[PDB]
Ligand binder design. Structure first.
Ligand SMILES: CC(C)CN(C[C@@H](O)[C@H](Cc1ccccc1)NC(=O)O[C@H]1CO[C@H]2OCC[C@H]21)S(=O)(=O)c1ccc(N)cc1
Lengths: 99, 99
């Protein structure tokens, strides 16, 4: 697909057996998903952007499907205002920026 | 060009006549640049990011060149951690996401 940027580039994802809406985000390497009760080991992390930092849980090797494309990698879970798919998983689904 | 996402999609911009580095950011509605002297009238505004809200100076109708492509639009100036080119200008240079 080609996604123009008039509107937020939102897609459906599947993670932890749940469907969610998420924003395709070239602005960070990591993926951040809103609080959800994912099973297994995690490590505390703090990530910072406009407005400051939030505390998240870093989960590794999380299976996540993005607009019908399978991926697996690190997923940060925490009180982000918007689910954001970062460059790490964008590369796995073959996403590029074009102009 | 076509830009893959293994690395941060950083480009050189020119704004207020000065060269700077900035991040092409599909996860940003708006363009936010670190504090700088910029010619033009501005209006006080607030914007929210992952960590909360900040005050910015809103400059409308600003000439800005992005990786050699011309845009004229709204540039927010304030305490962002990274210069970011958001969708308001990415659309002007005809950027799309593709996978
Ligand atoms: C500021 C960037 C360098 C980094 N961010 C990604 C960025 O794309 C966020 C992604 C984002 C998107 C929506 C809400 C919160 C965060 N967008 C953002 O802050 O944009 C702001 C400018 O335009 C406005 O439109 C959206 C918010 C405003 S970030 O969300 O803060 C972030 C920071 C660190 C990590 N590890 C992961 C993500």
């Amino acid at each position: 697909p080609q996604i123009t940027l008039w509107k937020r580039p939102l897609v459906t994802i599947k993670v932890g057996g749940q469907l969610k809406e998420a924003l395709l985000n070239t602005g960070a390497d990591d993926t951040v998903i809103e609080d959800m009760n994912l099973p297994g080991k995690w490590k505390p992390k703090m990530i910072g952007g406009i407005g400051g930092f939030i505390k998240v849980k870093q989960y590794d090797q999380i299976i996540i499907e993005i607009a019908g494309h399978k991926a697996i990698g690190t997923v940060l879970v925490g009180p982000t205002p918007v689910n954001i798919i970062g460059r790490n998983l964008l590369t796995q689904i073959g996403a590029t920026l074009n102009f």
